């Protein structure tokens, strides 16, 4: 019953089904097969080179299927017609999709989402344009071939004795339509060869995703042994809802899914708010409403005070609008495809949303609540077509005495003024003229480089847009007095946008801005970026400061979603708190010059006036903002993008003039016939003459934009602070119009989202209605619009930053992709990529995913990542070597290798992955392996692994490879500009640098910093990576040939560093009983393996999570801005070890100045080490990423309280050693809780037997002072630790 | 503005490495932009008595 056997058997049968005739034995470490490709064969034929047996080897390998290349068999991948063994189901959705197919004559060239267009056997221009749009729109990306997914779905369905409907429609398709398309295994992005409709890939991809969900719930319910889910006191079938949504969203999935996702979220938010009694979870935190010191006590039930309020007009209107929105969705679906179906169970749910109770303490309600949020993931990434539209200046609201636009501008300017003053109060100041050329690299993470830069290597010319390379190559030309005074307000000088995908919404568009514009924005907006990122502020309206009011910068800073959103759980369980969340529609459009631009530029100018004395290359400040913001530079600027195309007739193109066909400089898509100007195209455009498409070339089609742009350095700051002004106006107005009805307790602003915690002092209906009306009227008067359909005003529910809380519990939503990807990923390191994916799956299972299904998915993916990456390499007689010779007798063959699934559970350090079969949150290590095999209870789990750990071949990794052939023609002219006063002084003097070089600084000395930063920037660039990948094969053969099937477990990984294996020096004992009372936590929706861990060990109440030395150092280096990407803590430790001990603070400060470090960060870091002086050791802690995932940061582990409660250690051990012991203890206690073993305190025991004490004494002496670097590094023997070692264990 | 010999702080203020005090805790601090201006103000006040 152990998972390690059924999972292995399942994946093995998947292997046979993918590759018939395989000999993939379980015990073998890997399997090697050969494959044939004739793509090189025809081109070698055409150029006069001859071969031996033409295609005859196909003719025999398909049938007799025993071609042997040095005895290694050659197999073929299974065709579509036999993937599901020819089964059929006659699904209604199949003919629904058949009816959805539409001929080419109905094409809309400017559709956001393409429809289901049929492919024609003949070729014509319109369908070549359809192909062009489909290849970059309708595509899959991903990292695994889809056929692997299909085989997995088929066999998993067979194993579960259940059939998913997506598999049914896939089988019904392939039964009669055979091969839909082709995918390159080496290059997954090469999808081609459409057969039936141009929409068939995503469909199948979507048909896959639904299947996973149909399995997920099917497993999840099995872990709770419930027959059906619960809605109040009514049974409900989840697969019915899923198939219902499926048959609805079939014909045009992207658009209708996007426009229909919102009512689901509204429903799940509003469920159960008006139940007559209500069940909540007790909570306790600080006086402030944003406090994070929350603990949880008990479940209770209490009468609902607000039960009478829900009969108001506002709630009735919200319900009406939501339901009618569902009606337009269903009628549009019924109009597009000839179907008569509807969404029954959803309206039976929705008609009584307010009154039906909600039960957090029952799993049946909770799983449903998460499931409705998780439904929307089926369609992939919402790739959407974009268009260019003018700003249409006539619609914006001019200021007038009947409105409040001038008041909003005044308040936002004033708010900016105190924002800058509060930034200055923390000694944050603008950059000096030298500091500007030092640190324009300080640009915000939202910025995008407009112009590209060229890299020349030896010959080969590449283009790039990275901030680092662009700055390093052409920053001196950014602020030169030639490019600064020009304006981007003409056809010759414009700016070009970019596109980016998001997991759920449509394809977002971004603005690419030249550095000559962002740098003046940088100078005035950078200190705000540094300041507002701070966390833990006060959100009281009567507080003078505004630092704590902004949540921007407090985004994933803690790292645990449950931890940093505890205020939502606290306030959602309070009977005295009414929350209001306001969101806008077309918000960024409404940021106009009347309400957003003029006041903000005036505030910037007023705040920069005190600093006007500073001469930025002879430019005065106000004129520098004029560069930064002004007419023709940012405002009223033309932007390029998609060429607008108009539909005409080919005959009309024949009647056109030759001069009208004069193509200009602007590029045109190959499927579109170009003309000169738009005006001559207007002469022949016709709605009924569907023959051809025409695009202009004179450049009269690109748009003109005047509103805010997402490419600026302080976009989020500006939007949030505008939100702050609007919020102040609404509070003032509601206070004026109704005194005492609503009192505001807390306000928060982040991005385009606002949140208010208030107390409502009434239960009357009409008063609430008039209050809501006043709020909406104020928002309308502020030159904006707030949608009442999705505006939130509720007692018992909180939503913030995609986090949902209902009645004190955490209701997760699963939106992480598992099949698709936002952008093409090239796996330069299979091990690191697999670690990233197991991190993602840990998060997903923490959000309520099934644990065992996650293990199955990872055991699938752990074998096919490395395949198809090997080329130009052949293995004969167990020796790996280069591709044949000039003989070319077997030039058409390639080697494919398949790893073993169980390699998922063998530690890194060997050739494996650190996953643990008992619980994914535990990191497998060598010491963990030996303890796991020393525990009896785990034996049945360990048995399949028990015979494999020594047969895993080395993995692929290109980034480690480096060569002396790295010569680039592009050089440096800017390291002298980024040089700060200390290194500039060092380089300026003639010959003191020779005296400087005697210091142990090494490669980061002045002069050498330039070459180091060129080296780092070049190795972090993808321009030259193809050459390294091509050359890497030889070293790969060398590594495989040198591979030895031996396992060693070297206790000391390296002389300077130490790991958790050190903990195996001593013996560990278990004794003593502890309190068995289970704790309380809000995330009740968990798998049992995680649930028992959260039960035995409570939530992390302590903010501190303990801190090693190196992590203290890099957290200090976080304050530094310019060198966070170049200076690691390892170099600092190396220098401090090599520098000596007896130095003072100022000596270290000077050394850090010669390290180019800022003086205040250096002062803090030197003070830290001078405090840590006496008990400081020379040891480095190398942890294998343990206790760093999503779930563990929620547990009360690796804290001081945890150490005092669970661990007792001898006093002899120093700080780094007890840190390693603590990590070992965390792993062991988590493991023991997972298996259900009784909880006991752990003892570190040292026996009085003299031989043992001598052995540990010798080992510690070797560890602290090794025989190898005692020669090289010439360490001082006067450190307190090494002296204490003399009689420590005597 | 000149600075004294560092050895003064190395033989006297930081003589004992196992103890600390108010003088040793700020012997490593470095002035900011405004504090140097304050020093200039102090010297200007000194140069014009009364």
């Amino acid at each position: 019953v152990a998972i390690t056997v059924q999972g292995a058997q399942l994946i093995k049968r998947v292997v046979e089904r993918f590759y018939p005739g395989i000999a993939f034995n379980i015990n073998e470490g890997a399997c090697y097969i050969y494959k044939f490709s004739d793509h090189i064969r025809r081109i070698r034929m055409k150029h006069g080179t001859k071969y031996r047996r033409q295609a005859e080897e196909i003719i025999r390998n398909i049938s007799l299927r025993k071609e042997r290349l040095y005895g290694i068999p050659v197999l073929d991948e299974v065709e579509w017609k036999y993937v599901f063994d020819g089964q059929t189901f006659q699904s209604y959705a199949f003919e629904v999709y058949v009816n959805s197919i539409l001929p080419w004559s109905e094409l809309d060239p400017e559709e956001e989402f393409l429809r289901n267009y049929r492919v024609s056997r003949e070729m014509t221009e319109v369908e070549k344009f359809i192909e062009f749009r489909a290849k970059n729109e309708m595509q899959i990306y991903g990292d695994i071939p889809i056929k692997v997914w299909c085989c997995f779905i088929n066999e998993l369905s067979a194993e579960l004795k259940h059939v998913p409907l997506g598999m049914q429609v896939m089988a019904d398709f392939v039964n009669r339509f055979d091969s839909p398309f082709h995918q390159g295994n080496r290059d997954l992005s090469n999808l081609e060869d459409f057969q039936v409709a141009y929409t068939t890939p995503l469909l199948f991809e979507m048909c896959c995703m639904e299947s996973i969900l149909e399995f997920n719930i099917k497993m999840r319910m099995r872990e709770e042994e419930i027959s059906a889910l619960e809605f109040g006191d009514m049974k409900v079938d989840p697969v019915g809802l899923l198939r219902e949504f499926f048959i609805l969203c079939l014909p045009h999935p992207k658009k209708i899914n996007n426009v229909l996702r919102a009512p689901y979220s509204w429903f799940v938010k509003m469920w159960g708010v008006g139940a007559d009694p209500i069940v909540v979870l007790q909570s306790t935190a600080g006086d402030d409403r944003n406090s994070k010191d929350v603990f949880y006590d008990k479940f209770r039930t209490e009468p609902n005070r607000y039960k009478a309020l829900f009969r108001s007009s506002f709630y009735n209107e919200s319900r009406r609008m939501n339901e009618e929105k569902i009606l337009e969705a269903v009628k549009y679906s019924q109009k597009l495809g000839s179907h008569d179906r509807r969404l029954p169970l959803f309206e039976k749910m929705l008609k009584t949303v307010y009154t039906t109770p909600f039960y957090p303490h029952k799993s049946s309600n909770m799983i449903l609540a998460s499931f409705l949020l998780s439904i929307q993931t089926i369609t992939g990434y919402g790739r959407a077509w974009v268009k260019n539209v003018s700003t249409e200046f006539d619609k914006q609201l001019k200021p007038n005495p009947s409105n409040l636009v001038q008041d909003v501008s005044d308040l936002t300017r004033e708010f900016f003024k105190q924002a800058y003053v509060e930034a200055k109060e923390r000694r944050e100041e603008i950059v000096k003229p030298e500091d500007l050329y030092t640190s324009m690299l300080r640009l915000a993470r939202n910025t995008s480089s407009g112009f590209s830069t060229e890299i020349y290597v030896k010959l080969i010319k590449i283009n790039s847009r990275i901030k680092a390379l662009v700055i390093f190559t052409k920053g001196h030309t950014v602020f030169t007095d030639e490019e600064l005074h020009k304006k981007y307000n003409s056809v010759e000088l414009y700016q070009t946008k970019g596109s980016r995908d998001v997991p759920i919404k449509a394809t977002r568009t971004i603005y690419s801005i030249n550095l000559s514009v962002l740098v003046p924005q940088l100078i005035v907006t950078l200190p705000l970026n540094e300041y507002f990122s701070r966390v833990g502020g006060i959100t009281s309206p009567d507080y003078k400061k505004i630092g704590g009011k902004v949540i921007v910068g407090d985004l994933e800073a803690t790292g645990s979603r449950v931890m940093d959103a505890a205020d939502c759980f606290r306030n959602s369980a309070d009977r005295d708190i009414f929350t209001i969340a306001i969101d806008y529609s077309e918000y960024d459009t409404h940021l106009t010059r009347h309400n957003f631009r003029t006041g903000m530029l005036q505030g910037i100018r007023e705040a920069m006036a005190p600093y006007r004395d500073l001469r930025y290359e002879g430019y005065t400040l106000e004129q520098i903002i004029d560069f930064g913001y002004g007419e023709g530079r940012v405002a009223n600027t033309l932007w390029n993008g998609k060429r607008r195309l108009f539909k005409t007739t080919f005959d009309a193109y024949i009647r056109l003039d030759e001069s009208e066909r004069d193509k200009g400089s602007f590029k045109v898509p190959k499927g579109v016939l170009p003309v000169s100007s738009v005006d001559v195209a207007n002469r022949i455009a016709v709605d009924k003459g569907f023959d051809t498409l025409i695009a202009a070339t004179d450049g009269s089609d690109l748009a003109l934009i005047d509103t805010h742009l997402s490419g600026e350095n302080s976009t989020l700051i500006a939007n949030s602070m505008h939100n702050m002004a609007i919020g102040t106006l609404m509070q003032r107005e509601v206070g004026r119009e109704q005194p005492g009805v609503l009192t505001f307790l807390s306000e928060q602003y982040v991005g385009d989202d606002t949140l208010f915690y208030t107390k409502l002092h009434t239960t009357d209906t009409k008063v609430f209605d008039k209050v809501a009306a006043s709020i909406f009227d104020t928002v309308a008067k502020c030159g904006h619009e707030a949608s009442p359909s999705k505006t939130m005003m509720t007692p018992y529910s909180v939503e913030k930053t995609q986090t949902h809380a209902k009645q004190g519990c955490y209701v997760p939503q699963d939106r992480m992709m598992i099949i698709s990807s936002e952008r093409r990923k090239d796996i330069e390191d299979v091990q690191g990529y697999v670690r990233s994916q197991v991190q993602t799956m840990i998060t997903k299972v923490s959000r309520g995913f099934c644990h065992d299904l996650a293990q199955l998915i990872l055991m699938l993916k752990t074998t096919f990542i490395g395949a198809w990456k090997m080329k130009r390499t052949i293995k004969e007689d167990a020796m790996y070597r280069d591709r044949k010779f000039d003989s070319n007798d077997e030039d058409g063959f390639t080697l494919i290798q398949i790893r073993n699934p169980l390699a998922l559970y063998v530690p890194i350090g060997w050739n494996g992955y650190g996953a643990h079969p008992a619980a994914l949150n535990i990191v497998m290590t060598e010491e963990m392996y030996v303890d796991s095999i020393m525990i009896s209870k785990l034996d049945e789990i360990m048995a399949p692994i028990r015979r494999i750990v020594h047969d895993i071949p080395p993995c692929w990794n290109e980034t480690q490879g480096d060569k002396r052939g790295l010569i680039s023609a592009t050089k440096m002219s800017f390291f002298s500009k980024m040089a700060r006063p200390a290194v500039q002084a060092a380089l300026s003097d003639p010959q003191i640098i020779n005296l400087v070089e005697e210091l142990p600084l090494g490669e980061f000395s002045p002069g050498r910093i330039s070459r180091t930063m060129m080296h780092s920037a070049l190795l972090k660039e993808s321009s030259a990576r193809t050459l390294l990948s091509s050359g890497y094969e030889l070293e790969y053969q060398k590594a495989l040939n040198s591979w030895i099937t031996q396992v060693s477990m070297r206790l000391g990984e390296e002389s300077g560093v130490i790991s958790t294996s050190y903990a195996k020096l001593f013996d560990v004992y278990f004794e003593g009983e502890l309190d068995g009372a289970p704790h309380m936590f809000p995330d009740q929706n968990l798998s049992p393996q995680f649930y028992i861990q959260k039960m035995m060990i409570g939530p992390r109440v302590s903010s501190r999570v303990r801190n090693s030395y190196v992590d203290r150092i890099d957290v200090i280096l976080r304050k530094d801005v310019v060198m966070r990407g170049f200076i690691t803590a390892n170099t600092i430790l190396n220098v401090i070890e090599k520098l000596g001990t007896n130095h003072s603070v100022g000596d270290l400060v000077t050394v850090f100045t010669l390290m180019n470090i800022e003086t205040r960060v250096a002062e803090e870091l030197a003070e830290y080490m001078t405090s840590e002086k006496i008990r400081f050791d020379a040891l480095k802690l190398l942890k294998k990423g343990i206790a760093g995932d999503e779930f563990t940061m929620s547990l009360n582990v690796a804290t001081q309280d945890f150490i005092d409660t669970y661990l007792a250690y001898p006093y002899q051990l120093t700080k780094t050693e007890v840190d390693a012991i603590s990590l070992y203890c965390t792993q062991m206690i988590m493991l023991r809780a997972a298996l259900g073993l009784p909880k006991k305190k752990m003892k570190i025991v040292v026996t009085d037997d003299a031989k043992k004490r001598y052995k540990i004494r010798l080992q510690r002496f070797r560890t602290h002072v090794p025989k190898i670097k005692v020669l090289k590094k010439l360490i001082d023997p006067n450190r307190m630790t090494v002296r204490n070692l003399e009689n420590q264990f005597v | 503005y000149i600075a004294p010999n560092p050895r003064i702080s190395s033989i006297t203020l930081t003589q004992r490495i196992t103890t600390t005090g108010p003088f040793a805790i700020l012997t490593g601090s470095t002035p900011t932009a405004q504090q140097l201006n304050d020093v200039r103000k102090i010297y200007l006040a000194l140069m014009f008595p009364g």
Partner: peptide
């Protein structure tokens, strides 16, 4: 002794630089 011999020089160099 070997430290301040360099520290004094670099301090004087920084002074002469500013």
């Amino acid at each position: 002794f070997a430290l301040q011999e360099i520290m004094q020089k670099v301090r004087q160099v920084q002074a002469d630089y500013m």
